[PDB]
Design a protein around this ligand. Structure first.
Ligand SMILES: *Cc1c(COP(=O)(O)O)cnc(C)c1O
Lengths: 337, 307
């Protein structure tokens, strides 16, 4: 009667709400016995949860969509990390540039399956063809392989892998700005990180899932309210995260955490479209999420998505150079009709 | 159709055979798709495997025995780390001494469950009573809490936690000998680390288990034969183990690796007796191992050297 929860990755700073929910006893106060597990290989994750072998866990939006398409019955019941900047990371001097064509003849790292597909597909739109480049499967070590020169560039998230590149550059006395990204968010939200359930587990235990999300919500509020105290609680439990890199990653992630846990209807509509178009998704495919098990009201709708993206970009820079914890203040949406 | 394999701990240097069997493709050459998982809490482990939620994994002998007793159908099919030195670790100046009585009024860390029971029980034999001491559950952080002063002593393995204390001492310029253990040869195979199977999974998949053990055996031979090459393969995959502490731990573990994977009939006989006696095991309890799935003969009853 323990409930298996499988992370999408080795412990990261953004996993803080799950671990705090455990260590602070919020799961216990809901009468839940969670067994948090960590994958050795992120690609095992959708298959294990989809097949019922694991009850719940986390995976990105693009992968959660493709999971149902490939016949793994999973449903997103909430959102953890909202729309982090994803792209092809590289160091200045790679010599890769904003010219997508500069990827020609380069070794490019992707984590598992979908990213490669993502680049296979972008080449056609830039007059390139696979293989004008060599794709290299890297699992959880994309950043590491860029730093070690085993690849020229690689796919990653701004608040995780980019921060790893920047910390390396700092050790070399090079400026942070030498860590550059070719954003895919402008070639979005594929890499939103979701709480997902096995479909039959969800059918059979809706009350437990609802209680889970309450515990998570309590921990998420704590982390947003008191990030510093939260962090020290986390790294006492998970000493592997007790370093400056993890802490910096944590600060960059702060602005991306979902405060309401709601699945964003627009984000899914966008991503389902993109995926449908890439033959990953059947033409009649329906988005596999629900907000039924969230026990609190939903917030006002997304405004100026490009505006927010631009504003977020600016915000994340201030975060890097100031070392702060600030949520992106957002002007509410004006309806002209 | 992936097979879930749950480690007994965060990745350690002694998990190297498993990871190498994966990264070197030995699991693949047997037509196995293993999903190696890591626990966040070692105590979840027997219950998850016992209940069938996870197919296979690792666990110490004392825990694997108590799992069946507590109604979790698990069976040991092979052995990984043989009889590492287990005991109460402490720093000289704690001030704890070889006198078990010195544990009086001290904070003593235990990993999760059986560790506490082991000390509750040893006190009765030393005229002490729980609680002449405070037991503190520490999970995977016993050494860390000793170093940080949050506990005075704690239960651990010589090649893992003790090495962690020693590396701390070296950072302080203190001698390694200041990391001391009260060894639980105070009545050491409880902490032998076993490959274990869910019973029903074993019933329904004996050919796969046999093939798993073959991949493991191949990796195990590689590690013993070429420990240095093996290590760099490991830490390329698992960069969290790329540090001097992990490498030192690895060298201490090397002598303890089981080279044949066989369950040792004597070790189990001893441990089953101990467990029966303190009330951890029913009087009619039968050891839950088998060497049936091993496909090779049983052998006769800063360096890398086998003993
Ligand atoms: C499960 C496990 C533990 C936890 O056991 P307790 O003594 O009950 O804390 C400790 N060490 C190892 C190696 C384990 O596998």
């Amino acid at each position: 009667d323990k409930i298996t929860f499988l992370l999408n990755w080795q412990p990261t700073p953004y996993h803080i709400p799950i671990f705090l929910a455990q260590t602070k006893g919020y799961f216990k106060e809901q009468g839940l016995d969670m067994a948090i597990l960590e994958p050795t290989n992120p690609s095992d994750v959708t298959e294990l949860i989809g097949s019922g072998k694991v009850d719940m866990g986390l995976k990105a939006m693009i992968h959660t969509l493709a999971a149902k398409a490939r016949g793994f019955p999973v449903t997103s019941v909430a959102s953890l990390l909202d729309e982090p900047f994803t792209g092809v990371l590289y160091l200045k001097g790679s010599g890769i540039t904003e010219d997508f064509q500069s990827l020609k003849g380069k070794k490019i790292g992707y984590v598992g399956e979908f990213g490669k597909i993502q680049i296979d597909e972008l080449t056609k739109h830039y007059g390139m063809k696979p293989e004008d480049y060599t794709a290299v499967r890297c699992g959880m070590n994309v950043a590491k392989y860029i730093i070690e020169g085993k690849i020229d560039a690689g796919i990653g998230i701004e608040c995780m892998q980019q921060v790893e590149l920047e910390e390396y550059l700092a050790k070399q006395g090079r400026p942070a700005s030498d860590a550059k990204m070719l954003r895919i968010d402008k070639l979005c939200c594929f890499c939103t990180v979701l709480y997902i359930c096995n479909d039959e587990f969800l059918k059979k235990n809706p009350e437990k899932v609802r209680k889970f999300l309450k515990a998570i919500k309590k921990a998420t509020d704590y982390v947003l309210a008191d990030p510093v105290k939260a962090w020290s609680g986390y790294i006492d439990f998970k000493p592997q995260l007790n370093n400056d890199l993890s802490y910096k990653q944590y600060q960059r992630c702060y602005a991306y955490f979902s405060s309401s846990l709601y699945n964003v209807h627009r984000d899914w509509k966008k991503v389902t479209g993109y995926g449908k178009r890439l033959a990953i998704l059947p033409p009649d495919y329906v988005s596999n999420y629900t907000n039924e098990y969230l026990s609190w009201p939903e917030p006002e709708e997304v405004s100026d998505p490009l505006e927010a993206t631009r504003l977020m970009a600016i915000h994340q820079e201030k975060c890097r150079q100031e070392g702060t914890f600030k949520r992106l203040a957002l002007p509410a949406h004006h309806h002209h009709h």
